[PDB]
């Protein structure tokens, strides 16, 4: 049901697209998983631990 | 005057500190010091953050 929902977009149904390097512009080969993880910000800051 | 200058952290005390920091190790140690490689000395390179 993810791949079917991915096919409702025009995104590749394996999950992985082909990413190009930011600095040098040549691609990473063997394509890379991208997507949207819900990343948190935990209550361990470096402003309170330094 | 040195105390008020480096409390102000003027544009010269970074030059004096990077002079001070050059070959002067810092003992970096992490807490469960099970063996002697839990304490090693490193030359410090000034980063921000």
């Amino acid at each position: 049901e993810i791949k079917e929902l991915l096919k409702l977009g025009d995104l590749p149904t394996s999950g992985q697209i082909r990413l190009y390097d930011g600095r040098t512009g040549e691609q990473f080969e063997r394509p890379v998983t991208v997507g949207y993880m819900y990343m948190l910000k935990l209550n361990h800051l470096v402003d309170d631990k330094m | 005057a040195a105390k008020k200058m480096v409390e102000r952290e003027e544009a010269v005390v970074w030059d004096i500190l990077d002079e001070v920091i050059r070959e002067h190790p810092v003992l970096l140690n992490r807490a469960p010091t099970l063996h002697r490689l839990g304490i090693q000395a490193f030359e410090p390179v000034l980063i921000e953050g």
Binding site: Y36, Y38, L40, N43 | -
Partner: protein
């Protein structure tokens, strides 16, 4: 909001008291950044009452963990609400859904 949620996110947001949940239905008489005035409908108005109830929002107050607790009213002017429905999201809530 979490794009990939569990559907529990709305229930935990509402049941934790940090949201401002409409006790009765009605239409917003007035919205403000610190208060929401809900003109209650004739259905549930309890005939010895004055008509509206004022939700006094909690602005930039301090948490136990020294963070900020702040309520943003998500509804607009004249927007009809029901009872139970979220009018102001608490800290870490997007539209009455848990938003961590």
């Amino acid at each position: 909001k979490p794009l990939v949620g569990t559907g529990m996110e709305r229930a935990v947001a509402v049941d934790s008291g940090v949201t401002a949940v409409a006790k009765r239905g009605g239409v917003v008489q007035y919205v403000d950044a610190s208060r929401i005035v809900i003109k209650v409908n004739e259905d549930e108005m309890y005939p010895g009452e004055a008509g509206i109830d004022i939700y006094n929002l909690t602005k930039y107050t301090r948490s136990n963990q020294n963070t900020c607790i702040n309520q943003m009213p998500c509804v607009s002017l004249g927007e009809p609400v029901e009872r139970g429905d979220v009018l102001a999201d608490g800290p870490s809530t997007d539209l009455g859904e848990l938003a961590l």
